[PDB]
């Protein structure tokens, strides 16, 4: 007769990831590459968001 023994699939080997273009460049160069840094009592906090 006929007998259903196993199941056939195709296991994948590679994975792909797609995301949209990286756009909103965070302010870092204005902090680490800044020309002037404030005194140690007028400390510079800059908010990055």
């Amino acid at each position, epitope marked *: 007769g006929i007998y259903q023994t196993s199941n056939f699939r195709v296991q994948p080997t590679e994975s792909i990831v797609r995301f949209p273009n990286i756009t909103n460049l965070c302010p870092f160069g204005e902090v680490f590459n800044a020309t*002037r840094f*404030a*005194s140690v009592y*007028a400390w*510079n906090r800059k908010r990055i968001s």
Partner: nanobody
Amino acid sequence: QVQLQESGGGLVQAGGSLRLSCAASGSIFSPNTMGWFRQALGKQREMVAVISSIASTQYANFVKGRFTITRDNTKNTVHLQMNSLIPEDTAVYYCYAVDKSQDYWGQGTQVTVSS
């Protein structure tokens, strides 16, 4: 662009009087501190005086009881009364806004006293 205008120096004989002025424009958030600093050719910045938002006045021991700072709240300006001058005071001065962020210095006022 925070800009501070300096005025009121020049040539004065020994014993004369002058009135310097720094007027501040730009951001200059409310808790600011206006100071004045000395430099003669051959020396570094010598701290002369300081006024904060508290209106407290601070002066160095070099010129005890001779110079004064006046504070104008309406225009947020500063006037330094230079009285009882002595040729040891021959030095260009610069004023300094501590503020809360990037600091800004002056363009200079030539103060000369000799006989």
